[PDB]
Structure 1
Amino acid sequence: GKRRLVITPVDGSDPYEEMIPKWRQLNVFEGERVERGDVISDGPEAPHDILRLRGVHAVTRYIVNEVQDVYRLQGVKINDKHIEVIVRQMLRKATIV
């Protein structure tokens, strides 16, 4: 199966390489300027993983819209402002490195 590091982005220093099961569906193709935190595959994404780059204004918009996706296929409509009030609660803490 494929190796690399989940589509290892090549920079101007020293790249990195790991491994990942073949049970992953491809989403992003070649020739795409993608940074850290942006979902590469499909489905849910580790909140603690994207937390390293996204920060707050980005990690929040993701979890809010992601939930609005499953309620989108159903047919019911609900304003995302009902989630932006409960997600902010997870922004009360901040560990010190």
Structure 2
Amino acid sequence: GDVISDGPEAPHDILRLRGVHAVTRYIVNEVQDVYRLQGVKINDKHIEVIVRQMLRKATIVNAGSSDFLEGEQVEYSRVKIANRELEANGKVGATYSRDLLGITKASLATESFISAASFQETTRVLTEAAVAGKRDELRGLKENVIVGRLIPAGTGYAYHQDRMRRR
């Protein structure tokens, strides 16, 4: 992580060398510099939120007792839950390397091909979804708006939880 040259760093080097808290601290302090210069007050919770959503994928280093590929870029939550159920048994989990994608690649690379198709590059998404024979579980806020049911966010939260526990 120490500098072998000089210049501005890219927050993937920061990510994979100095960690994840280093890159959140970097992105937060930088966008907050840009705002604070103009006298805009924005609490940091919000920038930490968008950063969290920029760290969702995770490449795999070694499979282990799991069933992911080698260089497959799986989501971080799938890895977390799979390894947490493996360590519940006696097996040994999988080691991963966090990724960091911009807000435009972390949206097209989410788990629902209806969110992605309604965001951007519709043809490019429906093609890959069609050949991969994908399947959308209807779970975000935008798919429940497109379809026409309650968003799972406010009062729709109570509704959707009742409906999910009914199965």
> TM (normalized to structure 2)?
0.32
Show the counterpart of 2:49.
Answer: 85
Runs of 4+ in 1 over 6 A off after TM superposition: none
Show the counterpart of 1:51.
Answer: 15
Q: CA RMSD in A?
A: 2.2
Matched residue count: 60
Measure, in 2, the Cα distance between the counterparts of 1:76 and 1:85.
18
Q: Tell whether the 8 Å contact from 1:71 to 1:77 is kept in structure 2 after alignment.
A: yes
Show the counterpart of 2:29.
Answer: 65
The structure in which a higher percent of residues are strand is 2
The structure in which a higher percent of residues are helix is 2
Return 5+ residue gaps in structure 2 as ranges.
62-167
Structural mapping, 1:1-97, within 5 Å: 36=1, 45-97=9-61
Return 5+ residue gaps in structure 1 as ranges.
1-35
> TM (normalized to structure 1)?
0.51
What SS is found at the alignment partner of 1:47? coil
Measure, in 2, the Cα distance between the counterparts of 1:78 and 1:91.
21
Over 3 Å counting, the alpha-carbon distance change for 1:95 and 1:50 in structure 2 is same
